[PDB]
Amino acid sequence: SMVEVLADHPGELVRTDSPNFLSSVLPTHWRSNKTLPIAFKVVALGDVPDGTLVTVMAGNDENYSAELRNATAAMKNQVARFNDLRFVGRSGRGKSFTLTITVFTNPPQVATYHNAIKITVDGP
Numbered sequence: 001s002m003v004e005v006l007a008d009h010p011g012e013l014v015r016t017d018s019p020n021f022l023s024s025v026l027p028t029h030w031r032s033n034k035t036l037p038i039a040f041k042v043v044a045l046g047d048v049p050d051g052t053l054v055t056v057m058a059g060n061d062e063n064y065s066a067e068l069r070n071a072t073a074a075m076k077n078q079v080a081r082f083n084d085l086r087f088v089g090r091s092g093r094g095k096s097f098t099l100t101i102t103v104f105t106n107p108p109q110v111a112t113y114h115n116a117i118k119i120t121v122d123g124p
């Protein structure tokens, strides 16, 4: 259930737009191609089988799909941990990217990260 998931990951997870998925926290603003401080995780709340692929894509109006690195992970015990997810493509100072999560169940489910993310050459 959701109480167990929160008891296994206390004060680490946050909501997505989808009631079936939670995720780890990402920085609001980060350096282009820099290693993340918290490794990305997608936690499923339903019965998602082991080996189910999760893919993340970043984008806005002027860039439908910004370049990423290691944007795919496999589900194991309801968690899909991204080994070294990095944001290469840059939103610039004027815009932020919306981060969309796709969990490849039959049929696939699409979820959105709760905040937009700003990606610049220097970062904060």
Ligand SMILES: [Cl-]
Pocket: 063, 065, 066, 067, 088, 089, 090
């Ligand atoms: Cl790009």
Ligand SMILES: [Cl-]
Pocket: 090, 092, 093, 119, 120, 121, 122
């Ligand atoms: Cl920039």
